[PDB]
Every structure is written in structure tokens, then in C-alpha cells.
Enzyme design. Structure first.
Site, short mmCIF file in Angstrom:
data_model
loop_
_atom_site.label_atom_id
_atom_site.label_comp_id
_atom_site.label_asym_id
_atom_site.label_seq_id
_atom_site.Cartn_x
_atom_site.Cartn_y
_atom_site.Cartn_z
CE1 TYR A 1 -6.30 10.93 -15.91
CE2 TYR A 1 -5.14 12.89 -15.18
CZ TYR A 1 -5.18 11.53 -15.35
OH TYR A 1 -4.14 10.75 -14.91
CB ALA B 1 -7.67 2.61 -12.64
CE1 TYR C 1 -4.15 10.53 -21.41
CE2 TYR C 1 -5.42 12.02 -19.98
CZ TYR C 1 -5.27 11.33 -21.19
OH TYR C 1 -6.22 11.46 -22.18
CG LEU D 1 1.07 3.40 -7.33
CD1 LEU D 1 0.45 4.47 -6.46
CD2 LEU D 1 1.88 2.41 -6.50
CG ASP E 1 -2.10 1.12 0.95
OD1 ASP E 1 -1.83 2.12 0.24
OD2 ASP E 1 -3.23 0.97 1.49
N1 NAD Z 1 -4.71 3.34 -18.52
C1 NAD Z 1 -4.53 4.53 -19.09
O1 NAD Z 1 -5.24 4.93 -19.99
C2 NAD Z 1 -3.41 5.41 -18.61
C3 NAD Z 1 -3.01 6.57 -19.48
C4 NAD Z 1 -1.92 7.33 -18.89
C5 NAD Z 1 -1.35 6.98 -17.67
N2 NAD Z 1 -1.78 5.92 -16.97
C6 NAD Z 1 -1.10 5.64 -15.70
O2 NAD Z 1 -0.66 4.29 -15.60
C7 NAD Z 1 -0.69 3.87 -14.22
C8 NAD Z 1 -1.43 2.54 -14.07
O3 NAD Z 1 -2.83 2.74 -14.32
P1 NAD Z 1 -3.66 1.67 -15.19
O4 NAD Z 1 -4.26 2.42 -16.36
O5 NAD Z 1 -2.74 0.49 -15.44
O6 NAD Z 1 -4.84 1.21 -14.18
P2 NAD Z 1 -4.74 -0.11 -13.26
O7 NAD Z 1 -6.07 -0.81 -13.31
O8 NAD Z 1 -3.50 -0.88 -13.65
O9 NAD Z 1 -4.52 0.46 -11.77
C9 NAD Z 1 -3.22 0.76 -11.26
C10 NAD Z 1 -2.93 -0.15 -10.07
O10 NAD Z 1 -2.46 0.60 -8.96
C11 NAD Z 1 -3.01 0.04 -7.76
N3 NAD Z 1 -3.12 0.98 -6.61
C12 NAD Z 1 -4.07 1.90 -6.40
N4 NAD Z 1 -3.83 2.54 -5.22
C13 NAD Z 1 -2.71 1.99 -4.70
C14 NAD Z 1 -1.93 2.23 -3.46
N5 NAD Z 1 -2.30 3.18 -2.56
N6 NAD Z 1 -0.83 1.47 -3.25
C15 NAD Z 1 -0.48 0.54 -4.15
N7 NAD Z 1 -1.18 0.32 -5.27
C16 NAD Z 1 -2.28 1.02 -5.57
C17 NAD Z 1 -4.37 -0.51 -8.16
O11 NAD Z 1 -4.67 -1.70 -7.43
C18 NAD Z 1 -4.20 -0.87 -9.62
O12 NAD Z 1 -4.03 -2.29 -9.71
C19 NAD Z 1 -1.37 4.99 -13.45
O13 NAD Z 1 -0.36 5.74 -12.78
C20 NAD Z 1 -2.03 5.84 -14.51
O14 NAD Z 1 -2.09 7.21 -14.11
C21 NAD Z 1 -2.78 5.14 -17.40
O1 TCL Z 2 -3.84 8.37 -15.75
C1 TCL Z 2 -4.84 7.77 -16.47
C2 TCL Z 2 -5.17 8.26 -17.73
C3 TCL Z 2 -6.19 7.65 -18.46
CL1 TCL Z 2 -6.62 8.28 -20.08
C4 TCL Z 2 -6.86 6.55 -17.93
C5 TCL Z 2 -6.52 6.07 -16.68
C6 TCL Z 2 -5.51 6.68 -15.95
O2 TCL Z 2 -5.17 6.20 -14.71
C7 TCL Z 2 -5.87 6.62 -13.60
C8 TCL Z 2 -6.74 7.70 -13.70
C9 TCL Z 2 -7.45 8.12 -12.58
C10 TCL Z 2 -7.28 7.45 -11.36
CL2 TCL Z 2 -8.20 7.99 -9.92
C11 TCL Z 2 -6.42 6.37 -11.27
C12 TCL Z 2 -5.71 5.96 -12.40
CL3 TCL Z 2 -4.59 4.56 -12.28
#
Ligand code: NAD
Ligand code: TCL
Ligand code: NAD
Ligand code: NAD
Ligand code: NAD
Ligand code: TCL
Ligand code: TCL
Ligand code: TCL
Lengths: 287, 287, 287, 287
Positions: A182, A224, A172, A121, A73
Site C-alpha cells: 500500500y 483502482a 483503509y 475517491l 474532479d
Molecule cells: N476497494 C478496496 O479494496 C478498498 C478498501 C478500503 C478502502 N477503499 C476506499 O474506497 C474508495 C473507493 O475506491 P474503490 O476501491 O471503489 O476504487 P474505484 O475503482 O471505485 O475508484 C474510486 C473512484 O474515484 C475516482 N477518482 C479518482 N480520482 C479522482 C478525482 N481527482 N476526482 C474525482 N474522482 C476521482 C475514480 O474515477 C474512481 O472511479 C477509495 O477512497 C478507497 O481508498 C477501497
Molecule cells: O484504499 C484501498 C485499499 C485497498 Cl485494499 C484497495 C484499494 C484501495 O483504494 C485505492 C488504493 C490506492 C489508490 Cl492510488 C486509489 C484507491 Cl481508490
């Protein structure tokens, strides 16, 4: 020669964390998963029942290699930070050594020093509200879990890392340009994180000869991403229609960049935001 | 199939072109050198004479495999464009088919379609004058040889490239922040190169599914750097003292990044200016 | 025709808030000061005893015009947020209507709607520590008081503001480039603030036709600048030596830009970070 | 003393040059127009004929006070640079002293030292072709008339300017983000202009204490905009629909910013690219 990477942020095989794990596996890096307690047990049960077996397949005659899976965590820096209520919560009561410092130690005791660290995360209680409607608590919540977690991860993991180690996180573009939807101060958090990446690159480069960068990823339909209310479907459709490269963006597209950045190949790159988004960021208007 | 990369901008072994050539060779990429006519015959002489033998060593494994070495002038697009003076020149008279189109055709005739293109050249007749004292002829020369050359390269080379191919060029941070000795409109040329990289990314991405990126390198004591105003000894000394990573920037540091960006590993990256300068660009001022 | 501006962040006449107040005064804007309770009474006493009389002088036969001076704490959004301990603190016990919402109401009741709002405040308990050594509480503290305060100021002041109103804040380049010494997560906070400025510009522009921008000011030897341990003397000396314009940067240099931005003259500018720093930001290295 | 501003780039009343002229006139700045020879005699005819009378109205107060109107070609630096064809041209034959240096001398001879300089012109013979299809002659033309012209203007005009003078030019966001119809190397020219603005800021600031900035305007339906590929009707419609501020961008919106940047009010701003586009540049994508 024995590469160990700790991926912080993995609840399933639909996020970037999984994609990063696969690509690193392909390079024979030993993978340790840090898993948030609310989803830890549902993750292990699924894994045990072979629900991810298809997802661990790499090409043929090559399947993923997960060295370890630890409860984690990123809210808590040390055992002394865990509030009494969480400590006895149904999902936390059966777990231990899940704070940032305790995982660092656990890892060190069990495998010695590591050389790759991944921050994958993010969280924000009020992500569904726009910035203007975000409460102080909700805003601070996003920065604490999404931004500071990075700084903490570094403070504690640098002691268990060898010189010339590499650290990446995920960001992002909403940090730099306005993306309605967002909310919750996630945009605020990403901006901080990208700025913190530069400041950390300075301290870590000088004091420890360790690199840190961040990948600004395009849209992926992760668990997420769906929590944002749909938003992600729109983002994906838009990106697939207007990006220089009109192709589906895969988690492994990010994985292979992460992999490069974590390897010695990128030894002269630090403090950067690298865009892995099919070139969408370079566009001004649709055509 | 093997990969073929044309590297435009090799004059000796002390520049970035050579370093990029070395790193691609590790990956078994077949290398073709584009050599500026004025230095073609001395390069050939040095090569025949085994003056580069040592610099072509990769390791116990294998040595740099150079497919071909041709004369290349980015100052001329087609055979029609060469003037009397150049046609009448000591160095050019003995050579032929060295214009951008001629080289495209010749490579294609000999080896077929290529899939990697490297723009590692620049020139500015008035580089030693500051921007205010640079003439129109001087300024347009810098843009012509350092900027447009990229657009020309693409226009002509795309017909001889496979889909999913990749192109890179080299830039410098003087485009974004003022670097006093970097005169003659070189700063201007680099600014235009970095923007042209985006526009080209859009066009090549949508029309041919081809990627283009640019690497913003830190200082390296090369033939060209040696000409500026010594400017380059200062830049190197400053970088090694104030960069986050205090270590010598090598041509192969940029080479390994070039290699990544030119491979399928970076399929999701386009139109970008990647910084390979040990993180110098992130600093506000000396500490 | 009756211009009213609320300057949030003024403890003396050595900061930017004062410089902004003077320049706005010169334009006949009615000035309301929002003053943090820890310094409120020492401020009033000084003012009453005519200690600022010299500082209120503008040219000749023209002296500053302060419509009102109100106690103000940007930590608290509404009366319901004020913790019991603060409510009975020696310095807070004699004051009332000092939360963001209560000042908004007080202002509205007393003077009706305003049309200019200035965010000139910032704070961080651990500013003296570097990012790496900053605790979660200290980091969240900086973001809460330095960053979120802006969002809150907007949420509550937009109700008491006329369409075509303008809002500015103050930022620093450490958000974008590394400035050692700018610790406690202040750099983090400024990055968030600059990103929040864009997101707010979107919501405020669409819903209320109100503009918001931020000034990234150069170094000024204000009370708070000294709290950073010296740091500010170095910053000033550096800026005066290496900036394109080698002249002393005055608080009124910022004032006159703020003044422009708050007036209808800048009606087509919103969401921007405007640099008022003698051009220092454009430099890469010293010369 | 009164102020004198030379405005290079006026062909009618529907462009930014005119809008900048109007706003400076409010401040009682004496205006001198630089008019491109091909349209000089039609401009003079329209003016004599009272076709601009209405557009010269400021308000009940006074009307635009135009000091002089001279022929000006940014394509030629000195009398020596004009070729046979231009010398032999219908429009030019009847005019003289229209090169950049000639105009500097002529203004100076007639009215003495000026203190405000405005670069409001651009040209690109191949604007209707995308970057990939633009020729070397076409590309260098764009840079020559749109980019270098700025450097030339400065080189020659500084001798006839007072210390503390101020210079501005106009740019477009296509330099930073891909705008599909903005071809012919105009994007490239703008990128170089924005970077040249920084380098010039350093030189003019240190050597003469003179400031230079550039305004990045949003779309305005002008003579030149009308030539692109209608491109401009789309840009305008998109901007008015998606910009934070949904209102018509007027030439005087840019004029009032130009006026501020050219006054002593902005003494601390130099080398900057100020955005006057209703905040369009901050948006990632349509909402
Ligand atoms: N998915 C997208 O479209 C996107 C676009 C740009 C950036 N990102 C970034 O990529 C990263 C991963 O996001 P994702 O899209 O893979 O969603 P995801 O479903 O992989 O969620 C990220 C993981 O972080 C974990 N997490 C949440 N709170 C936590 C805490 N306090 N301690 C430890 N773990 C925790 C969650 O269990 C989850 O499994 C994020 O930082 C997100 O901002 C995602
Ligand atoms: O950064 C992100 C960007 C996009 Cl387009 C989609 C998911 C993303 O990832 C997150 C966005 C908001 C929260 Cl509350 C937590 C996470 Cl991991
Ligand atoms: N050396 C540095 O410090 C540094 C830092 C950042 C970027 N770069 C960039 O890297 C690239 C390679 O330069 P380098 O530093 O390796 O020095 P270099 O001299 O080794 O490379 C420049 C080459 O370009 C060739 N060239 C010059 N004019 C030409 C023309 N008209 N047509 C074809 N070729 C021509 C020269 O023969 C020369 O070999 C350049 O674009 C430079 O801008 C260099
Ligand atoms: N001075 C500089 O060198 C400099 C450079 C760039 C930016 N800035 C920015 O300008 C702004 C003003 O800083 P300054 O340099 O004028 O210092 P300053 O001495 O004017 O301090 C700012 C004022 O904000 C007040 N304040 C602090 N916490 C508050 C709270 N919770 N609620 C209400 N008010 C509070 C303080 O009383 C102080 O009077 C800051 O945002 C700073 O980040 C300053
Ligand atoms: N109109 C827009 O939407 C817009 C948006 C951003 C920036 N700009 C910029 O504003 C500036 C003014 O253009 P505009 O939009 O007012 O259109 P405009 O046609 O009114 O202004 C352009 C002027 O430049 C002059 N010119 C062309 N070639 C010349 C040469 N060789 N020497 C001297 N003068 C020459 C023309 O006579 C013309 O009057 C341009 O630099 C343009 O890039 C315009
Ligand atoms: O871009 C560069 C940056 C640096 Cl620090 C050193 C050398 C560079 O490369 C050049 C600089 C000027 C000219 Cl005329 C030609 C070239 Cl190849
Ligand atoms: O932003 C600033 C930048 C500089 Cl160079 C000097 C002072 C600044 O202002 C602050 C800095 C830190 C804290 Cl805790 C509070 C404030 Cl008001
Ligand atoms: O920069 C511009 C941007 C826009 Cl949206 C509209 C017009 C512009 O101005 C020009 C564009 C192209 C050419 Cl050839 C000449 C000029 Cl004056």
C-alpha cells in the site's frame, strides 16, 4: 422526504461507490454521481448503451434511480485552480462546472440543498512505490487527491446542505497497521483522512450540526485496487481465510453501513472510523 | 419469520435497555425482557398498573410489543450456582428459573430459537470507591456481574440462536481514558468487556457465523448512573457543552444503533466498539 | 564508542531540539545541528557572542559539546529541487549543501557514518487557520515540511548510518484527538507522521536493521509554539492543572526519553508513538 | 542513597522477572525477589546449589546483587485472606508472612522505603480453554491473580515507597488483538491491567507523585509460556519471521526498558503501555 446524496467517486460498477449507490437507492434516496473526467465519457456511453442495466437491478421489480451524472474532479477547488493545460486537455475541454465549488453550485441551482454526501475517491501517482521510495511530489499528490479533497468537499458542500446532514468517506486499515504494497503515501493519506474526520466532526457538528464519519472497508476487487499491481488478490484471499467472518465481502456490505450512517438512525455518531471488514482488523496473527 | 430479541438488563424505562427495546419494536422485533430478581416484582407491578403505557408508545402506528418478561440474574450461570442467602431471599424465594442457563432453556422451550441478544447490564458493589480503595471481593464482583456475564450469556444462548444471529453489549469510554468517579473496577470491567468482545467475535464468527459488537454510549441519567459519584449530572452537562453535537443524548439514539447492529444490514461488522456519544470521545480537551 | 547524532530542527535554546541536544551531550554523544537558513546566521552570531553559554551548562564542570552546525532546509531533497528564487534569496545565497541529500554527504565526508538521527522540525504556512479554512497549498505545505521531510531524511540518511542505528521524531496528540487551534493541517501532518513511522519501521528494520520511533510531546513554550497565535499558554496551563503529574514539562524531560530511544537500550522498540506528556493523554475530562 | 526494587514474579531465570533484575543490577539497584510459595523452596535450593551463578553474571565488572528473596503470593492481600487448604498445604505450612501486606511490612521493617516496584506475574487456572469455555471461577481467577494483584500491590506498597517512585507491570497484545491460544480470560486480565494502569497513574500521580506504566512484551519461552496452547514456539517463530526487527527477543531487552521506566529518566511518562516486541504489533499481516 426527498433525500439527495452526492456520491463523489464512480467510474464503473465494480467499486464501493456503486455498492453505496444501490443500497441508498433501496432506501429511495435520490442519487447524483460525480464522475472524474478521464472516465466520464466512457461511463456515459456505457450507461446509455444499457451496459449497467443488469447492475442496476435491486431484488425484483425494483431498479436503481440515478437523479443525475456530473463531471467532477476533486483536484480542483474552484474554476480558478484549473491550470490552463488541463482546461484544454482532450478529455476536459468539452466539460464544465467540474471543480468542487462549481459542482456544489450546479447541484444547488438544479435541486436545492442536499442532505447526504459521500467521499468515495482516492489517487496517488506513485502507489506502486513504497513509502521510502515515494518522491515529495508523489506523496503530496496522494494527500492532495485522497485526503484534502475531503476537507474541500466539506468546505463547499456545507453551504448546500441542511442541518442534520451526514457525510461519509472510505478509508483503509493500512493507516493504523503496516500493509506492504500500500505505497505512494496512500497509507499516509488514509491516516490524515481519519484524523481529518475527527477535526471536521468538531467544526461541522458545532457550526452546522452536520455529521461526518469514515468507513474503513475490507478488500474489494475494484478498478483502482488493480492499479496497485497481485496485491488485491492476496488481500482478498487473506481476508476470506482469516477474518472472523469467512464470507465474501461485497460492495453492498459497505453500502448498507454507509446508508445507515447517512440516515438519521446514526444521529449520535460522528468523527468515527467504522470498520466494515468482516472483523479482520481485530486479528493479530493468522491461525 | 419474525425476529426475537432477548434484552438482559431492564429495570425501568429510563435506561438503555428500554431505548433499545423501543427501537427494535419499530422494526417489529418481538421483545423478551430479562429482569434482575430484586426489581422483578416492582417492575411487573408498575407494568400491570399502566405506569409504562406512555413510554411504550411508538407513534400513531403501533405500541411496543413485549413477548415476555422473565426474572434474570447474571450472577448465576446455572441452578447449582445460587447460594443459600439468595435462595433464602425475600425477592428470589417467590421466583424460579432465573439463572442464565435456566432462562436460555425457558425462552427456547416457549418460543424456540432467537436471533438477537442484548447485554445491557452492569454492577459493581464498590462502584463508589476509587480503584485504589476497591477490595478484591469488590473488584471481582464488578468483573463477574459486568464482564463475565457477557461470556456466560453467549456460551448458553448460542445453542438457542440461529446462524447469522447478532449480539451486542454496552460499554463506556472509562475503559480507554481515565474518568475519576467511575470506580469499583467498573473501568476494569469495561476494558475486559471490550477485549472479550473481540475474542468472542473470533470464536462466534468462525464457529457459528454469529456477530458480536459493543456500543460505547455517552451519559444517560438512568437508575444505575444515579448511583455513581452527582457524577451523572456533571457528565451530562459536560457532554452537552463540549461534544461535537450539542444535543441531548437519548436512550433511543443508542437504540437505533443497537437495532442496526442487530440486523442483517451490518453483516460485515464484528468485534467492534461503536461509539454513540455525540462524538464526545474525539475531543482532547474543553475548547 | 563515538556516537554521532544529527539533530534536524534547531533555531534556539527554547525548543525540544535543544533539550534533546543537552541530554545527548550528557551521554557523550557528538552533536551536529541542522539549522534552517532563515535563522542560521542569527543562530551562529548569537552562539559566537556566547549568548548560549548559560544554556550549554550541564550540572557543574560539564558543558555541552557541539561537533558541528550546518545550514539545513528539509524542504529540499537534493540540489536539483532548489527553485532558482530560493537559490538567490538573501538568506540562502551565501549557503551551500543545505538540501537533505547534500547534508547527508557533507556529514559523511566529514565524519563518516552516524548512528543517531533526530527529526525535530515542523512547519505550516496556514497553521493559524482551522482545517476547514485551510487551502490545498497550505495543507500540502504542512505535509511536505512536517511529514514527508521525515521520509526524505530517512531515504538519504540510511546510507550514512550503521546497522542498529536509531531515528526519532516529535509528534503531538492532536493527531489522535481534536485540539482546536492546532490548524493549517498540522494535525493532518502529525497523523501522517505517526503512520509513516510504522511503515518506515517495517522497511528500515527489515532492510537495514535500523529503528524509528516518535515522541508525542506535551506543550512547551518554544519559538514555533508562539507562532500559533494564546494557544500555548492555555495548553501549558491546562496540562499543568489536569495531568496525572502536575509538574512543569521541561525540554530535557523529552531529551532524556529521546536519548534512551536513540541508545541501544531500546533495541526492541520500533514503530511506536511514545507519549512524554506527564500522562495528560490518558485523561478523558478535567476534574 | 541506593535504590531498592521489589520484583514480584520470579520462579527461575528464564522469565522476564530475571531479565529485569539483571538490567537493574547493571544500574546498581538493590534487588528483592518475590517468589510464589509453591516454587520458593526449589528456587532457594537451586540458588544455594549455584544453579543460577552463570545467569547472575553481568560482565567482567560485578555480579547480580540480590538483597533478599521472600515468599510472595499475590492471591492473598492480608493474613486473614488465606484459606484452610493453603494454610494446610505442604509448601505453605513451612513459610509465613507471604501475603501482599505482610511482604510490604517485612521489606519495610528490614530495609526501609523502596522506590521501584515490578509486577511480573500472572496466572489463570483455565488458560488452556478458550474464552467461550472458561468458567466464572476460572475467569475471575485470571483477573484475581493477574489483574487485581497489581492494584493490591500498589495499595499496600505505596506506604513504603518514596515520592517520585516508579512501578511497572507486564502485559501482552492479546488484550488489543485476538490471539487464539491465549485463553482462560488471560486476554481479559491483560485488557483490565492495561486500563487499570491508566486509572492508577491518575491516582498515584496526583496523590503521591508516583508513576506507573506497563510493558507489552513479545514472546519469550518462559515457565508460564510453556504452559499455554506449542503456542509459545509458534509465537516465537512467527515473531522472528515477521517482526520489523528480525532478531531474538531476550528477557534483558525488556529488562533495559523496565530499567529506564523505573528511573528518573522517564519522569514525564505515566499511564502508558510501552511495546517491547521488536515492532511486531505494528504489522497488519504476514508479508
Ligand atoms: N476497494 C478496496 O479494496 C478498498 C478498501 C478500503 C478502502 N477503499 C476506499 O474506497 C474508495 C473507493 O475506491 P474503490 O476501491 O471503489 O476504487 P474505484 O475503482 O471505485 O475508484 C474510486 C473512484 O474515484 C475516482 N477518482 C479518482 N480520482 C479522482 C478525482 N481527482 N476526482 C474525482 N474522482 C476521482 C475514480 O474515477 C474512481 O472511479 C477509495 O477512497 C478507497 O481508498 C477501497
Ligand atoms: O484504499 C484501498 C485499499 C485497498 Cl485494499 C484497495 C484499494 C484501495 O483504494 C485505492 C488504493 C490506492 C489508490 Cl492510488 C486509489 C484507491 Cl481508490
Ligand atoms: N447510563 C449511562 O450513562 C451509560 C453510559 C455508557 C454505558 N452504559 C451501560 O449501559 C448498560 C445499561 O445500564 P443503564 O445505564 O441503562 O442503567 P440501568 O440501571 O437502566 O441498567 C442496568 C440494569 O442492569 C441490571 N442488573 C444489575 N445487576 C444485575 C445482575 N447481577 N444480573 C442481571 N441484571 C443486573 C439492573 O437491574 C439494571 O436494570 C450498562 O451496562 C452500562 O454500563 C450506561
Ligand atoms: N513545543 C511543543 O509544544 C511541541 C508539542 C508536541 C510536538 N512538538 C514537536 O516538536 C518539534 C520541534 O518543535 P518545537 O516546539 O521545538 O519548536 P522550535 O521552535 O524548536 O521549531 C522547530 C525547528 O525546526 C526548524 N524548521 C522549520 N522548518 C524547517 C525546514 N524546512 N527545514 C529544517 N528546519 C526547519 C525551525 O527553525 C525550528 O528551529 C516539532 O516537530 C513539533 O511538532 C512540539
Ligand atoms: N513470556 C512471554 O512470552 C510474555 C509475553 C508478554 C508478557 N508476559 C508477561 O510477563 C510476566 C512474567 O511472566 P514470564 O513470561 O516471565 O513467565 P514466568 O513464569 O517466568 O513468570 C510468571 C511468574 O509469576 C508467578 N506467579 C504465578 N502465580 C502467582 C501468584 N498467585 N502469586 C504470586 N506469583 C505468582 C510464578 O511463580 C512465575 O514465576 C507475566 O505477567 C506475563 O503475562 C510474558
Ligand atoms: O457504565 C456507565 C457509565 C455511565 Cl457515564 C453511567 C452509568 C453506567 O452504568 C453503570 C455504571 C456503574 C454501575 Cl455499578 C452499573 C451501571 Cl449499569
Ligand atoms: O507540534 C506542536 C505542538 C504544540 Cl502544543 C506546540 C508546538 C508544536 O510545534 C509546531 C506546531 C505548529 C507548527 Cl506550524 C510548527 C511546529 Cl514546530
Ligand atoms: O502473557 C503471556 C504471553 C505470552 Cl505470548 C507468553 C506467556 C505469557 O505469560 C503468561 C501467560 C499465561 C499465564 Cl496463565 C501466565 C503467564 Cl505468566
Amino acid at each position: 422526504n426527498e433525500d439527495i446524496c452526492f456520491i463523489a467517486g464512480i467510474g464503473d460498477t465494480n467499486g464501493y461507490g456503486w455498492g453505496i449507490a444501490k443500497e441508498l437507492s433501496k432506501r429511495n434516496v435520490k442519487i447524483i454521481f460525480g464522475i472524474w473526467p478521464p472516465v466520464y465519457n466512457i461511463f456515459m456511453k456505457n450507461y446509455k448503451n444499457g451496459k449497467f442495466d443488469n447492475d442496476m437491478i435491486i431484488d425484483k421489480d425494483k431498479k436503481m434511480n440515478i437523479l443525475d451524472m456530473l463531471p467532477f474532479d476533486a483536484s480542483f477547488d474552484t474554476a480558478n485552480d484549473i491550470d490552463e493545460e488541463t482546461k484544454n486537455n482532450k478529455r476536459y475541454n468539452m466539460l464544465q462546472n467540474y471543480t468542487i465549488e462549481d459542482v456544489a453550485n450546479l447541484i444547488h441551482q438544479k435541486y436545492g440543498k442536499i442532505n447526504m454526501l459521500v467521499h468515495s475517491l482516492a489517487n496517488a501517482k506513485e502507489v506502486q512505490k513504497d513509502l521510502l521510495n515515494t518522491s515529495r511530489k508523489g506523496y503530496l499528490d496522494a494527500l492532495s487527491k485522497s485526503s484534502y479533497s475531503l476537507i474541500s468537499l466539506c468546505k463547499y458542500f456545507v453551504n448546500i446542505m441542511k442541518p442534520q446532514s451526514s457525510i461519509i468517506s472510505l478509508t483503509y486499515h493500512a493507516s493504523q497497521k503496516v500493509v506492504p504494497g500500500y505505497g505512494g503515501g496512500m497509507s499516509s493519506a488514509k491516516a490524515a483522512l481519519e484524523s481529518d474526520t475527527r477535526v471536521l466532526a468538531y467544526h461541522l457538528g458545532r457550526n452546522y450540526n452536520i455529521r461526518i464519519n469514515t468507513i474503513s472497508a475490507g478488500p474489494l476487487k475494484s478498478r483502482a485496487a488493480t492499479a496497485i499491481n497481485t496485491f488485491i488478490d492476496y488481500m482478498i484471499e487473506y481476508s476470506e481465510k482469516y477474518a472472523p467472518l469467512r464470507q465474501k465481502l461485497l460492495s453492498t456490505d459497505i453500502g448498507s453501513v454507509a446508508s445507515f450512517l447517512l440516515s438519521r438512525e446514526s444521529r449520535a455518531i460522528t468523527g468515527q472510523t467504522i470498520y466494515v471488514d468482516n472483523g479482520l482488523n481485530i486479528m493479530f496473527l493468522p491461525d
